[PDB]
Symmetry: C2
Subunit: 488 residues, 2 copies
């Protein structure tokens, strides 16, 4: 392209997502057009995750994401306090409304009253509902598409249980699916962990998270979250039943909240992206193999052109027979060299070159998007050899990104190591008192020496925390090893 | 239930959709909760249609369905005149916005400017984009869920072409897919046809439509539409290229618009529904076969209970192996008789009863939701015999509804036959001048003698229009046989 990734990331990223026809800037801000290239990736993720959560007993539904003031003033539902911002609709044209209506506000405001209605007995539990929708914020700084965006697409699940053991179960299950989406579909390694008291979700008891690392900016990013809410909302909303083990006082529902967004795509783009542009993991690529007729002359036959085209469609029908996603760019108007670059910049995993010389030898050429390696392949071994290169591409992408995580995620036991390491461009696991004010402190001091933020308290830390080890503050004993870094 | 379909349709319909757990009334109006039972049907339709249009080269995307006034006053885009109502957002809380932003307004306002940008050469054509989203109106009378609703889910496709032949092609193709969705997935017979000058889409040259008939209300309903827009919008939006056949003056894009909604479900419900509640066509049922252990006594063994349950799961795993959607209601808390009624009212096509007496004889019982017919089935012939009953159920539902269309869609050649027939509760095909004022007339006179509306000008009329045949008005010659009836 026109920008190196290792010189100007921001320019590089902007040109990559535009030239690959993934997004188009819209006549809003922090709001963009999701073109089919990008949308396809989301749909791939959507297909996988949708299948998995259904094995868990979660069902999809639709909730009207608006509400009347007439319900808020009268306390049919409630708005929590930690939750800005509720944008209202006031004017059906230039004729102000009898009932003005609130946009968003929160999923909780809209859903939980209905959960309350649906829960009469213990028989009516669990309640596990997911929805795929869109959600808008109203504050920005300089919204990068995908990473920090005002508008996005996502799913969020809301579950209600009779016990805590059940609720706790789903939280880790769902978090793992998210870890799969990153590690399996996107070939992006993540760090599973719990969020600190500061960074956790205000409305819940605890928040689990997956954290992905971006070695370009040297920052980390939150992949997805699974919240245990406990009874904080079932009390606030009177979602309540009675259990014949105690017949009885009224017992409250245990709840869960989990969401994954389109930022996955931005992570994918930032991790795997090339100076030749996008590069897609075969698991999510709209097109994994592109068939391109190479060799056309302005002196070539007209029976050979019809034959060359027929061979391209022969490969295509065969690859379709093994569930490979394949396109044949059979166009007069563009040079093959153009098509090469066009699909290279859109990061199609395999380029399948079909030329008459090779076609004579009853063979073809497969080119890898990642390494750029060309392998001559027998026509007979098309289905097997190509499926093998796709799998090997997925593995290579993940392996490489996994080697960046282990290399840029190290341990610091003091504050002066911590600052030294963080400014090298890594994320760090440190001994931590676990205290909000100390977190606030670390952010402030690390900045002008921006600031390092708490990412998660990893389920599996690199090292064991020695008894008597102090937090980096020095004023307190360290409760747990905690992962810190400048984030998105 | 608590209401007969043939006494109080409105009550019957309201209880059917609530008791089958399809929808829940929300704290808005004309706005409802789409529960997973209903949502599943939409997802079935979504899966089929999504596949078909992709064979046509249409790709999915996402457009931010809001816009800034800052774009409307400055004429970056335009708002058409026939298009109310543009509700605005003004208040991010109680702090009015620098940029207030418009909701909806029209897909055209948001998309076509970008189409214009995307079209530079003839190479950049066609442009075929679909999106699955949600759309809100702001006027009602007494919004029935699904039929006439303020809020709904739908898809709409927008296509741009270099020629008219291409555009014309897609219109009929897309309309046919809609006809399939009704006739194949929903087993609902439809009448394909063109809309009159009055009822057509203001922004387009012509509008094609599918019309379904509901013998309960005696009314018809519009299933879906495919619009040819011609150049009306490519001129309005400067979507323009140049063609080397004439190099050249600037030629304009030919455009298309097609949408299908969730009203399908309401049609399905109204056509096939029972006095025992919902009944689902196997093609769209979330669950086609429900396995229910029958025979449990409070004197039954505890090794036979573990055996009976194992047999239920044996059938279940087998049916899953032939891509049948199956559930085993293995619950302690409800009588089998309860489960019978519970799934009967949710209209599960086949009830699969597993009892110990039958289990001794190495057999089971399959019950049809439609006819209520029970057939004793050998365990060995589970996969074949059940798949055969499902197909036969789909056929039976469609056949019956097709026999209602032919019976309630007749020909009238005068105005006094027309009124006689229409008040019997049928839809009618009449000789028609094709004139808006006459249409307006027919609506007025037919009402107090509400009013009959034009449905479509059928591609294939029942009878041939004899030369010299007069329109029902009598003041004009009849251009074409036209289908009329009171509608939704
Ligand atoms: Zn500390
Ligand atoms: Zn007339």
């Amino acid at each position: 392209l026109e920008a190196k990734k290792e010189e100007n990331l921001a320019d590089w990223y902007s040109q990559v997502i535009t030239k690959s026809e993934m997004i188009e800037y819209h006549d809003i801000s922090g709001c963009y057009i999701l073109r089919p290239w990008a949308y396809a990736i989301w749909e791939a993720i959507k297909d996988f995750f949708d299948a998995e959560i259904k094995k868990l007993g979660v069902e999809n539904c639709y909730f009207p994401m608006f509400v009347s003031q007439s319900a808020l003033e009268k306390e049919k539902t409630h708005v929590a306090d930690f939750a800005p911002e509720v944008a209202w609709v006031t004017r059906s044209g230039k004729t102000e409304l009898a009932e003005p209506i609130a946009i968003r506000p929160t999923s909780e405001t809209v859903m939980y009253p209905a959960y309350a209605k649906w829960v009469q007995s213990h028989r009516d539990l669990p309640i596990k509902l997911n929805q795929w929708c869109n959600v808008v914020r109203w504050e920005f700084k300089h919204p990068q598409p995908f990473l920090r965006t005002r508008e996005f697409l996502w799913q969020e699940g809301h579950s209600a249980f009779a016990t805590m053991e059940e609720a706790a179960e789903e939280v880790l299950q769902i978090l793992d699916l998210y870890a799969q989406v990153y590690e399996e579909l996107l070939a992006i390694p993540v760090v599973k962990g719990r969020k600190t008291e500061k960074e956790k979700f205000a409305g819940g008891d605890y928040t689990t998270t997956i954290e992905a690392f971006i070695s370009a900016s040297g920052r980390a990013i939150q992949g997805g979250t699974s919240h245990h809410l406990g009874q904080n909302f079932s009390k606030m909303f009177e979602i309540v039943f009675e259990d014949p083990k105690i017949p009885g006082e009224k017992q409250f529902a245990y709840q869960n909240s989990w969401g994954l967004t389109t930022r996955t795509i931005g992570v994918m783009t930032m991790v795997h992206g090339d100076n030749m542009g996008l590069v897609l993991p075969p698991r999510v690529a709209c097109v994994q193999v592109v068939i391109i007729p190479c060799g056309i002359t302005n002196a070539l036959s007209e029976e050979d052109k019809e034959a060359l085209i027929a061979k391209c469609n022969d490969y295509r029908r065969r690859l379709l027979s093994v569930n490979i996603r394949v396109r044949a760019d059979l166009r007069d108007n563009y040079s093959p060299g153009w098509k090469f670059n066009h699909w290279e910049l859109k990061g199609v995993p395999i380029r399948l070159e079909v030329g008459p010389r090779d076609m004579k030898s009853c063979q073809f050429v497969a080119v890898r998007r990642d390494t750029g390696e060309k392998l001559t392949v027998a026509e007979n071994e098309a289905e097997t050899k190509l499926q093998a290169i796709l799998e090997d591409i997925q593995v290579t992408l993940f392996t490489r990104a996994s080697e960046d995580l282990k290399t840029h995620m190290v341990v610091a036991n003091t504050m002066e190591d911590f600052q030294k390491i963080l400014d090298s461009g890594k994320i760090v696991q440190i001994p931590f008192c676990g205290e909000i004010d100390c977190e606030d402190w670390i952010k402030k001091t690390t900045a002008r020496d921006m600031g390092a933020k708490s990412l998660c308290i990893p389920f599996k830390p690199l090292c064991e925390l020695q008894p008597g080890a102090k937090c980096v503050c020095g004023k307190n004993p360290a409760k747990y090893y905690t992962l810190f870094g400048r984030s998105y």
